[PDB]
Design a protein around this ligand. Structure first.
Ligand SMILES: *[C@@H]1O[C@H](CO)[C@@H](O[C@@H]2O[C@H](CO)[C@@H](O)[C@H](O)[C@H]2NC(C)=O)[C@H](O)[C@H]1NC(C)=O
Ligand SMILES: *[C@@H]1O[C@H](CO)[C@@H](O[C@@H]2O[C@H](CO)[C@@H](O)[C@H](O)[C@H]2NC(C)=O)[C@H](O)[C@H]1NC(C)=O
Ligand SMILES: *[C@@H]1O[C@H](CO)[C@@H](O)[C@H](O)[C@H]1NC(C)=O
Ligand SMILES: *[C@@H]1O[C@H](CO)[C@@H](O)[C@H](O)[C@H]1NC(C)=O
Length: 671
């Protein structure tokens, strides 16, 4: 119900976000600036990094060696952003001066360093953000050494920048060994350069790195490369693309373990092969036993745009697909044993060019086999297919994230309209559909969500970032539902009905909700109320009602009968039934004064424990007087008698002139 905790931006737009797992503080990378915010998006420190005097053509940058083509003030876009919790700092890699990286200390953003005089201190000169991705890997704790796996496009600058490397993280930020490959010799290094040939063959070619995540002893990347097949050498602009997973080992210094499989999915014969975002989540016991996975097995959610055409602006039509971490390690261990049998060949047209074949070997591959000097780098033959969960043909999907709540498996997916649909994944939905979009919160109308979309540590809020602002969006928003009938009808996995407090909340937000009937799990368990009798004539006073309440806790605390906001009779309880009194006709008079033929009024049950009304039931006051004809009287839904001689309609039949004026039934009416 309250408004969204918000943090707008200066003149500069945002690019990346990440949350400190322990302090819950929110570090936000952006153009020229790197803001650090607090749990509620309150600004803490703001570190400026631009604009700077630079040209993209200056290799090395002007801060090391002079440069010819001329300088000019240009914006320094933060392309990547990671936390080194072990070293209590933050790595913000910019787009300025061939893409050096800064080391902002965590608790004040003190520029600890920006090493900028070596060749491998320049990661890439690309200007887009969101095309860079990577992970940190702390070594033994006392040592202080770490590693940093970075994939980036290189814009055909194959001599300067590797497209994917494994550089080292020194404890002393000024050190010149920063960003140096963790294994270097004349033959192979922890590097992976694009062949000077393929860029000569195919002019504009690059690997863009969307997501990246650590899993088991590996690191996986979801890349999106230009298809070397579906595109002619002519760089007209008709180039199609192909999304591919990539995986390395953390303990593979020579980079033998490389592997690259295409990915995508379909639903109703629609192709989706342009990866957009991806999130690694543990699926929670509900979706777990549904998929046969152990409690330690993970899942990868993905977002694909339709087709393979146009990378810089994919079509709106998008799908949220699922890959189980099992099924990916399988298609690998099946294709890299397929090599160690001598069948087929390594198939990487961009990295290898000349069709080298697979070599035989009497070795049995594990799940944890990290390559050898043969049968690598290994290609991908069949595109790994994903499981479609949700399609959107109107407002494109742009970002993804997920977690679990009390078994149920929740997926948050950002849209180009700026909304964040809350998706529940279950295979046992009787409709045959696997996912239900149970809500569509709007974080900022008219701005696509950016793919960074992480939760607070307590999983309470999800920070949904656009170009213009961050938005602390509440995961649970159960209070918004007003009655049990639609609190549980929303199918929100967090939401149940706290019956005795008349509020929609989480199973732990309802006081004493473990006791029976205090909480409502299934819809067919909403509070139900019945009254005997439902109607009384305004002529009557204080007629005894008997109410029967169903699906309610131990009401022995005490309960009142409240007729909307008029009478408030205190009640008594016997067996399973609630006795109380109708209003006295002195009280009934202003209730029905005006409402004419009848008035329905809500007969509530106010509990002594809470003090709030929790159960409602319709109660009717009728007024036989207002009926004008003999038939207005009789055929009325309620017992009214027509006095044919006085020409009036009443309840207590003593009002008639004589008895023979008693007209009970419609056929005994005169005309
Ligand atoms: C008005 O209330 C009365 C009583 O609560 C309802 O009349 C009952 O109708 C059933 C069905 O024929 C009978 O078995 C009961 O004996 C009736 N009771 C009495 C006291 O008449 C009546 O249906 C209600 N009508 C409306 C429109 O609410
Ligand atoms: C039941 O209905 C009758 C008729 O509508 C109400 O009596 C009328 O009250 C108005 C306003 O005071 C008078 O101007 C009319 O002359 C009255 N008509 C009759 C026939 O008495 C009566 O007040 C209603 N009873 C309740 C409890 O609301
Ligand atoms: C926001 O949170 C900070 C700490 O995280 C707190 O000091 C501040 O009072 C809060 N302000 C608002 C408006 O919520
Ligand atoms: C129940 O009704 C009586 C009658 O006035 C009132 O005094 C009492 O406060 C009511 N109980 C609650 C919980 O409102």
């Amino acid at each position: 119900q309250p408004p969204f905790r918000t943090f707008s931006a200066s003149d500069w737009g945002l690019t990346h976000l990440v949350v400190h797992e322990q302090t819950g503080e929110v570090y936000v990378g952006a153009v020229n600036r790197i803001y650090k915010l607090s749990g509620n998006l309150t600004l803490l420190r703001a570190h400026v990094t631009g604009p700077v005097e630079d040209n993209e053509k200056c290799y090395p940058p002007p801060s090391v060696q002079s440069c010819p083509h001329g300088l000019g003030s240009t914006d320094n876009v933060n392309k990547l952003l990671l936390l080194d919790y072990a070293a209590n700092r933050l790595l913000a890699c910019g787009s300025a001066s061939q893409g050096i990286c800064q080391f902002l200390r965590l608790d004040d953003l003190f520029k600890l360093g920006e090493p900028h005089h070596r060749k491998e201190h320049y990661l890439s000169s690309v200007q887009e953000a969101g095309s860079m991705a990577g992970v940190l890997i702390a070594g033994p704790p006392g040592q202080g050494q770490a590693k940093l796996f970075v994939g980036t496009p290189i814009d055909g600058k194959s001599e300067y920048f590797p497209t994917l490397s494994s550089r080292r993280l020194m404890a002393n930020e000024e050190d010149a060994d920063m960003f140096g490959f963790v294994y270097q010799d004349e033959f192979v290094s922890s590097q992976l350069k694009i062949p000077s040939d393929t860029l000569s063959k195919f002019p504009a070619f690059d690997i863009y790195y969307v997501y990246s995540f650590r899993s088991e002893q590996f690191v996986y990347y979801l890349t999106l490369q230009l298809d070397t097949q579906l595109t002619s050498p002519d760089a007209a602009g008709e180039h199609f693309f192909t999304s591919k997973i990539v995986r390395l080992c953390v303990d593979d210094p020579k980079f033998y373990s490389y592997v690259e499989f295409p990915i995508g999915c379909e639903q109703a014969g629609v192709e989706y092969r342009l990866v957009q975002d991806a999130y690694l989540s543990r699926p929670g016991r509900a979706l777990a036993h549904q998929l046969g996975l152990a409690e330690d097995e993970d899942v990868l959610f993905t977002v694909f745009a339709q087709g393979q055409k146009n990378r810089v602006k994919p079509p709106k039509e998008s799908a949220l697909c699922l890959f189980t971490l099992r099924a990916i390690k399988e298609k690998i261990k099946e294709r890299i044993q397929s090599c160690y049998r001598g069948e087929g060949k390594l198939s990487l047209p961009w990295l290898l060019n000349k069709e080298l074949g697979c070599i035989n070997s009497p070795l049995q591959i594990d799940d944890d086999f990290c390559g050898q000097d043969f049968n690598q780098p290994l290609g991908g033959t069949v595109t790994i297919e994903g499981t479609p969960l949700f399609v959107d043909k109107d407002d494109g999907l742009t970002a993804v994230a997920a977690y679990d709540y009390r078994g149920r498996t929740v997926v948050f997916a950002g849209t180009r309209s700026g909304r964040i649909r809350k998706i529940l994944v279950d295979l046992s939905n009787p409709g045959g559909r696997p996912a239900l979009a149970y809500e569509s919160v709007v974080a900022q109308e008219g701005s696509p969500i950016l793919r960074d979309l992480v939760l607070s540590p307590n999983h309470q809020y999800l920070y949904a970032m656009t170009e213009k602002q961050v938005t602390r969006v509440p995961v649970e928003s159960c209070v918004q539902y007003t009655s049990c009938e639609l609190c549980l009808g929303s199918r929100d996995p967090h939401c149940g009905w706290c019956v005795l407090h008349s509020i929609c909340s989480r199973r732990d937000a309802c006081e004493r909700a473990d006791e029976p009937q205090r909480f409502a799990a299934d819809l067919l368990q909403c509070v139900q109320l019945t009254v005997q009798p439902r109607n009384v004539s305004v002529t009557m006073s204080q007629v005894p009602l008997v109410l029967q309440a169903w699906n309610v806790p131990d009401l022995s605390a005490g309960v009142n009968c409240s007729f909307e906001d008029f009478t408030e009779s205190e009640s008594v309880l016997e067996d399973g039934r609630i006795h109380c009194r109708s209003p006295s006709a002195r009280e009934v008079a202003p209730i029905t004064r005006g409402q004419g033929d009848q008035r329905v009024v809500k007969l509530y049950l106010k509990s002594k424990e809470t003090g709030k009304k929790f159960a409602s039931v319709d109660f009717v006051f009728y007024n036989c007087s207002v009926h004008q004809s003999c038939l207005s009287c009789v055929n009325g839904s309620f017992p009214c008698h027509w006095c044919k001689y006085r020409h009036v309609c009443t309840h207590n039949v003593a009002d008639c002139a004589f008895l023979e004026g008693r007209v009970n039934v419609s056929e005994d009416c005169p005309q």
